Structures are given as C-alpha cells and as structure tokens.
Design a protein around this motif. Structure first.
Motif, mmCIF file in Angstrom:
data_model
loop_
_atom_site.group_PDB
_atom_site.id
_atom_site.type_symbol
_atom_site.label_atom_id
_atom_site.label_comp_id
_atom_site.label_asym_id
_atom_site.label_seq_id
_atom_site.Cartn_x
_atom_site.Cartn_y
_atom_site.Cartn_z
ATOM 1 N N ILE A 1 0.857 -1.176 0.000
ATOM 2 C CA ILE A 1 0.000 0.000 0.000
ATOM 3 C C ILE A 1 0.900 1.234 0.000
ATOM 4 O O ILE A 1 1.889 1.294 0.737
ATOM 5 C CB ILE A 1 -0.984 0.018 1.194
ATOM 6 N N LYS A 2 0.581 2.200 -0.855
ATOM 7 C CA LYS A 2 1.388 3.410 -0.962
ATOM 8 C C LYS A 2 0.596 4.624 -0.508
ATOM 9 O O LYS A 2 -0.526 4.843 -0.958
ATOM 10 C CB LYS A 2 1.880 3.618 -2.397
ATOM 11 N N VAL A 3 1.179 5.409 0.390
ATOM 12 C CA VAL A 3 0.495 6.587 0.906
ATOM 13 C C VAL A 3 1.342 7.839 0.782
ATOM 14 O O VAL A 3 2.531 7.775 0.465
ATOM 15 C CB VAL A 3 0.079 6.405 2.373
ATOM 16 N N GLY A 4 0.715 8.981 1.030
ATOM 17 C CA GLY A 4 1.426 10.240 1.038
ATOM 18 C C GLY A 4 0.501 11.390 1.358
ATOM 19 O O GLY A 4 -0.709 11.312 1.128
ATOM 20 N N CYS B 1 -3.178 10.500 2.006
ATOM 21 C CA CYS B 1 -3.873 9.899 0.872
ATOM 22 C C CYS B 1 -3.424 8.468 0.583
ATOM 23 O O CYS B 1 -2.244 8.142 0.704
ATOM 24 C CB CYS B 1 -3.680 10.756 -0.381
ATOM 25 N N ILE B 2 -4.375 7.619 0.203
ATOM 26 C CA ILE B 2 -4.058 6.288 -0.305
ATOM 27 C C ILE B 2 -3.880 6.409 -1.816
ATOM 28 O O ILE B 2 -4.809 6.797 -2.524
ATOM 29 C CB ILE B 2 -5.170 5.264 0.019
ATOM 30 N N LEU B 3 -2.685 6.091 -2.306
ATOM 31 C CA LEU B 3 -2.352 6.326 -3.708
ATOM 32 C C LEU B 3 -2.353 5.033 -4.514
ATOM 33 O O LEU B 3 -2.834 4.995 -5.648
ATOM 34 C CB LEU B 3 -0.998 7.025 -3.816
ATOM 35 N N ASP B 4 -1.806 3.979 -3.923
ATOM 36 C CA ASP B 4 -1.828 2.664 -4.545
ATOM 37 C C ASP B 4 -2.017 1.604 -3.466
ATOM 38 O O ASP B 4 -1.631 1.805 -2.312
ATOM 39 C CB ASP B 4 -0.540 2.416 -5.330
#
Ligand SMILES: CC(=O)SCCNC(=O)CCNC(=O)[C@H](O)C(C)(C)COP(=O)(O)OP(=O)(O)OC[C@H]1O[C@@H](n2cnc3c(N)ncnc32)[C@H](O)[C@@H]1OP(=O)(O)O
Length: 174
Positions: free
Chosen positions: A76-79, A99-102
């Motif tokens: 899971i990718k966030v930022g 934010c959840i990006l991927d």
C-alpha cells in the motif's frame, strides 16, 4: 524474484520511502521489487501505466508498506497531498490529508484478510483514523473493503479524482 527477499526484508511489513533505505547493490534490489509491484498493481487495476515505481518513489514524498510472509504478497502506498477539496456547500478548501495512492494484494491471495492486515498497520504507524483519508480513484473492491472494515460510506463527490467519506471534515489536515 531471483533474490533472497527474506534477507532483504526480514520483517513481515517493511516501511520504505523516497530513500529506499534497506531495513547497496540491494537498494537496487528494492527498486526491482517496487518496479514489479507497481506493474502488477497496474495490471490488476487495468491501468495502461503503473502509478508506482522506483523512479517515482524517489521523486516524491510517498511511503510504501510492503507485505511479505513466511515472495512479496502486496503493498500500500500513501502520502500527504495538497488537495483543494469540495465540501457540502460547493466550497473548495485547501487541505493536506493523508492519501491512499496505490494498494495491491496479489490475486492468488486476495480476500484472505491481507489487505486489512496491511491497512491496519499503516493506520497505526501514520496515526490516522480511516475517515481522515482521501483516496485516489478507489476501485470497487477498495470501496467495499473500506465499507466492511471501517464502515466508510462516500460523502461529497469531488471534482478532482479523490474520494472522501462522511467524517472527513473534522480535521485540519496538516
Ligand atoms: C487507492 C487505490 O489504490 S485503488 C485500487 C485498489 N486496488 C485494487 O482494486 C487492486 C486489486 N485489489 C486488491 O489488491 C485488494 O482487493 C484490495 C483491493 C487490495 C483488497 O485487499 P484484500 O486483501 O483482498 O482484502 P481483504 O481480504 O483484507 O478484505 C476483504 C474485503 O475486501 C473486499 N474485496 C476484496 N476483493 C473483492 C472482490 N473481488 N469483490 C468484492 N469485494 C472484494 C470485500 O469487502 C471483502 O470483504 P468480504 O469478503 O466480506 O466481502
């Protein structure tokens, strides 16, 4: 992969950032992993191009949580991102939510609870409630996922491609 994944990633969930700083010709091993993971997520999401890669993780302020087990299961990718968010009064407000990006779990082991496992860990380290999050084009799976686990039901439709939920307007988002 053609490498000792467990040697590179001893832990079940590895937290990485713009510096793929290992837990250095294996910092390149981390790259190949991020690069393949991102493409796998792209295929799963029917994307023509990955939204997650090594080149891009380096060029951003994004965090990836990579799940392994005792072979990478998913990520899971966030930022944090500056979004100008539409509220219920048609007013746009500057915020900087997490934010959840991927978000990807390998197809063979989808729906085994690995998404939640990865998600709970991220929520704990980032110290955020699910309703503070903005999500970048959530899939149908993610929407049902978020509704089951966290009772998240969509609120004010945005004009950007982010989705927020009932409860988002409660935090200041810095
Ligand atoms: C912001 C973004 O990145 S958007 C895109 C999100 N990514 C994707 O859609 C890629 C493919 N999907 C996945 O990788 C994973 O399904 C997510 C979407 C990563 C979910 O991870 P999982 O580990 O499968 O979820 P987990 O088992 O933890 O949770 C299961 C719940 O998620 C939902 N879910 C998962 N797969 C499906 C499916 N095929 N159909 C419907 N719901 C699903 C359901 O709520 C399910 O609960 P239920 O079985 O009681 O209905």
């Amino acid at each position: 992969f053609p490498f000792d994944v467990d040697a590179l990633f001893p832990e079940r969930i590895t937290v990485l950032d713009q510096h793929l700083r290992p837990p250095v010709d294996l910092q390149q091993q981390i790259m190949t992993i991020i690069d393949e993971l991102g493409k796998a997520s792209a295929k799963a999401q029917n994307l023509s191009a990955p939204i997650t890669s090594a080149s891009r993780m380096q060029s951003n302020r994004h965090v990836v949580y990579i799940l392994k087990d005792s072979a990478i299961i998913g990520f899971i990718k966030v930022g944090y991102k500056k979004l100008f968010v539409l509220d219920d009064r048609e007013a746009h407000n500057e915020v900087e939510p997490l934010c959840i990006l991927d978000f990807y779990i390998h197809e063979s082991v989808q729906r085994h609870g690995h998404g939640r496992e990865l998600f709970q860990y991220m929520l704990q380290k980032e110290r955020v409630e699910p309703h503070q999050l903005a999500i970048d084009r959530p899939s149908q799976k993610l929407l049902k996922f978020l509704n089951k686990h966290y009772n998240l039901e969509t609120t004010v439709p945005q004009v950007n491609n982010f989705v927020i939920f009932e409860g988002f307007f409660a935090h200041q988002h810095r």
